[PDB]
Nucleic acid binder design. Structure first.
Ligand SMILES: [Mg+2]
Ligand SMILES: [Mg+2]
Ligand SMILES: [Mg+2]
Ligand SMILES: [Mg+2]
Ligand SMILES: [Mg+2]
Ligand SMILES: [Mg+2]
Ligand SMILES: [Mg+2]
Ligand SMILES: [Mg+2]
Ligand SMILES: [Mg+2]
Ligand SMILES: [Mg+2]
Ligand SMILES: [Mg+2]
Ligand SMILES: [Mg+2]
Ligand SMILES: [Mg+2]
Ligand SMILES: [Mg+2]
Ligand SMILES: [Mg+2]
Ligand SMILES: [Mg+2]
Ligand SMILES: [Mg+2]
Ligand SMILES: [Mg+2]
Ligand SMILES: [Mg+2]
Ligand SMILES: [Mg+2]
Ligand SMILES: [Mg+2]
Ligand SMILES: [Mg+2]
Ligand SMILES: [Mg+2]
Ligand SMILES: [Mg+2]
Ligand SMILES: [Mg+2]
Ligand SMILES: [Mg+2]
Ligand SMILES: [Mg+2]
Ligand SMILES: [Mg+2]
Ligand SMILES: [Mg+2]
Ligand SMILES: [Mg+2]
Ligand SMILES: [Mg+2]
Ligand SMILES: [Mg+2]
Ligand SMILES: [Mg+2]
Ligand SMILES: [Mg+2]
Ligand SMILES: [Mg+2]
Ligand SMILES: [Mg+2]
Ligand SMILES: [Mg+2]
Ligand SMILES: [Mg+2]
Lengths: 98, 138
RNA sequence: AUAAGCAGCUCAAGCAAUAAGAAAGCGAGAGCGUACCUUUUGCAUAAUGGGUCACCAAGUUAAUUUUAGAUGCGAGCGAAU
RNA sequence: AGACAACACUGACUAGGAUAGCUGGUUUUCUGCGAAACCUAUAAUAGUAGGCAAUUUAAGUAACAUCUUAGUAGGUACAGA
RNA sequence: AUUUUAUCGGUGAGUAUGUAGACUCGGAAUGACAAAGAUGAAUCUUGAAUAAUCAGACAUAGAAUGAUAAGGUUGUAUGUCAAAAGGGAAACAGCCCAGAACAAGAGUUAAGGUUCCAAAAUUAUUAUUAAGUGAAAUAAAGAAAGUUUUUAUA
RNA sequence: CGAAAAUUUAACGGAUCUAAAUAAUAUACCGAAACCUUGUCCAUAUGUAACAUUAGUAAUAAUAUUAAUGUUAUUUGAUGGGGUAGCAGAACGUUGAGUGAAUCUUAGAUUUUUUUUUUAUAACUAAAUAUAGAUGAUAACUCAAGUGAGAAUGGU
RNA sequence: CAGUCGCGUAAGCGGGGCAUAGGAUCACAAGAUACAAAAAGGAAAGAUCUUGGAUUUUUGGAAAAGCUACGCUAGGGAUAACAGGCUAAUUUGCGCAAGAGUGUACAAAAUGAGUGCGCGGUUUGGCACCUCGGCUUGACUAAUCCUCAUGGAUGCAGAAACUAUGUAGGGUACGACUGUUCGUCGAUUAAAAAGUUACAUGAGCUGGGUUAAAUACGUCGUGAGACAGUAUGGUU
């Protein structure tokens, strides 16, 4: 193509820091909701599903925090900043093996 | 308890379904805060916009008047002396010095009723040609 | 008269009133800004049109058929005697 | 030689009588709301009509959106032989 | 006439290996339908009145097509542009933020950044690189007493 | 190292950097017309008070009230604010007309300028120049349109 | 629901077929209905219901063949030819890796099957963002024909040449044929190499090719005419 979308293949240490904090912030929203309901003895299927198949920022590997799965790439990995609205959508899990 | 929910990010380029979740919460602009009880029907509403809002558990709900007073700054001044003025509906309010505290408002259809000096008050002052300051004062 | 401005905007030194009072204007220097219209998915576009200024220059009228609002009369209305 | 018939000739000049689903143009301000480039039909495919539907403001709402809880339809990713 | 095979094809058996648009015994998430409740910015329906539009473009994911080429052509899902200014991407219709009624503020923030151009760190910690590699658009297979680490080993 | 293309270093934006590179972390700060605060403008509601106008209803010889309209303030410390095609509402201006046999004008009407002020497509203040008593100008309300032009290889 | 028929002991089933592939109006024709009947009685021509005949197959439904290079108007660049842009299948453009094999011997002096990984933007193409050659005069690239330095070469005795590494300062001429770039050939030369630049350069020149009106030939067409044909001529 001749139209230039200058998007670097890797992120800067500043974009990574904000990513860690956005993943950390989401964990606090879920924990705040889960703790508020536990005090009343209630549960929500969405929360129970999140805490079951989604890790916390402290439990994620750097590769899972800054990259995503892409079957079209050489090594099946791709910069997470290449996902649409990547700063406002949740993305923490990739297929096993990649 | 209650959920103190505040919109931190926008949903401009997000799907239409996300706009409805925010509309059902009452979040219309950034940094707008709402209060909802701690219930499943509201928790699930937050798990859909958890990437956009900030949540907090609070004991009680704050009123629209009490939620806006926590950002109100101190005025930084106090009117201690008000000069004579005319209020269209009430009347003429005489000078008041709140430092020594008396806002007396006089209304009428004649000048003497307003509490001001008239042409007659100036003529009696001019005819008092005998009053003289005390020699000690001079 | 050391400079690469769609000539405007933001910041602004200085000059400017023979005199008490009164600073319009021009502006060094710094920064932001690629005309307008048309037509297009999309135009600074090297796509269309214009040398400048002034004037002339484009949803109107009639008949007919409807609607809204207002208003006259009212199971009658109008017209005409 | 489609050559010539007085600027014009694969049919002159002049007066009277046209259309153009195409191109261009359509002039003051403020305020409110706010699309589509899809479907169907067409001698259609630069057009048009009916829908979806933008707008005006009345009459309704057990309206519409979202989440929660329970329920239902249907076989993609995946996995398997 | 005759028998024999660690040769070919065929049949039977295998809870053997692979293969998948027209295989799906198993089977998500998502999306769809309806009920109740709650919430919300009237966003819905109807009546009356009454338009524009009918080559769209790009990004992301996943396909058909092409040559697993095209800023190619053509569906699906989502968004932006179109009709959206502003900050970031050096410059930028379509990307990352964010929706401009007008001012003031060393105000609070998003994406993005903080040596100078140029507002903000020459801010702290642990390692690697010596090639200006790199530092906002990753050229490949491959070679090699470059260097570091780890794991075995003399 | 592999790694070669034709104007010029030539896709770090440049200077330059041994980190101001790379990887894994932490904090502060900057940062938009976003947000907040204080004010302003506009649009659309809710009640209340007051001012003015118009039209009614009562009182008055020893003023009050009702309704509509305009307006300011105030209550809920009300809500809302990009925009093409397109739809809608509210206004200004131009020309002529009615009220007009009206109003004003040498004590200066009118003067294509300049200037001043006012939320202001407009009017107003003042200044300079000239000099008209109506074939002059004009508020307000209303009526009717040959009514508003940087765009037509437009016309003069 | 009404009407009235069939089958069934009965309950009950039946308004064609297991399901999914057959077009209207108009006109015309055959039956019914008793509606209206242009003075009146009738009728004609109409109306309502049932029914029939359709590659109405451009199947929401016209009775319909061509040429224009003598051409014209309105438009589009919403769809082409040249150039630019994207792409790189292909190429008369290259490199690297591996090494069957050739080299009397011996893989790598030379040579290199079928392949793999790439570069580059010269050829023929795709897309549709966007509607020639010569002369004169240059600039630039380096993947080098000559000249300069140099490694390898059972296959470097010398000479000459082969291959390869540096290197683009300068040079790369003359003629015949062809409209030619290209190509073929003659004769010299140290050598008579390439490419990019709008396949550089026509507001610098040329106009032979392509090339509108004229004309002929062949072929095609019933014909007007046409042709990736040929020929002579044709305002730069
Ligand atoms: Mg480009
Ligand atoms: Mg100077
Ligand atoms: Mg130019
Ligand atoms: Mg132009
Ligand atoms: Mg011109
Ligand atoms: Mg005019
Ligand atoms: Mg006009
Ligand atoms: Mg002829
Ligand atoms: Mg002729
Ligand atoms: Mg709006
Ligand atoms: Mg659309
Ligand atoms: Mg037809
Ligand atoms: Mg058309
Ligand atoms: Mg199954
Ligand atoms: Mg495309
Ligand atoms: Mg939008
Ligand atoms: Mg458009
Ligand atoms: Mg923008
Ligand atoms: Mg930068
Ligand atoms: Mg600060
Ligand atoms: Mg600084
Ligand atoms: Mg570098
Ligand atoms: Mg550079
Ligand atoms: Mg704002
Ligand atoms: Mg806004
Ligand atoms: Mg608006
Ligand atoms: Mg004057
Ligand atoms: Mg003009
Ligand atoms: Mg009769
Ligand atoms: Mg049809
Ligand atoms: Mg049909
Ligand atoms: Mg001919
Ligand atoms: Mg095009
Ligand atoms: Mg040697
Ligand atoms: Mg030299
Ligand atoms: Mg050329
Ligand atoms: Mg030229
Ligand atoms: Mg001749």
């Amino acid at each position: 193509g001749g139209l230039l979308w200058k998007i670097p293949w890797r992120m800067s240490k500043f974009q990574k820091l904000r990513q860690r904090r956005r993943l950390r912030a989401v964990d606090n929203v879920v924990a705040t909701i889960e703790n508020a309901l536990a005090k009343k003895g209630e549960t929500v299927k969405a929360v129970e599903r999140w805490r079951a198949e989604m890790p916390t920022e402290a439990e994620m590997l750097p590769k899972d925090k800054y990259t995503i799965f892409d079957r079209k790439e050489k090594r099946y990995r791709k910069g997470i900043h290449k996902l649409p609205k990547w700063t406002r959508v949740s993305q923490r899990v990739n297929p096993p093996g990649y | 308890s209650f959920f103190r929910i505040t919109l931190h990010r926008s949903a401009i380029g997000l799907p239409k379904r996300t706009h409805g979740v925010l509309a059902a919460l009452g979040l219309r602009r950034r940094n707008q805060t709402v209060f909802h009880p701690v219930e499943p029907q509201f928790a699930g509403m937050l798990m859909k916009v958890k990437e956009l809002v900030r949540v907090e558990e609070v004991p009680h709900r704050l009123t629209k008047r009490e939620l806006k007073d926590e950002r109100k700054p101190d005025a930084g001044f106090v009117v201690e002396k008000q000069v004579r003025r005319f209020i269209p509906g009430v009347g003429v309010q005489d000078e008041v010095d709140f430092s020594k505290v008396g806002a007396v408002v006089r209304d009428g259809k004649r000048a003497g009723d307003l509490g001001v000096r008239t042409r007659s008050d100036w003529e009696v002052i001019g005819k008092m040609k005998s009053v003289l300051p005390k020699v000690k004062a001079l």
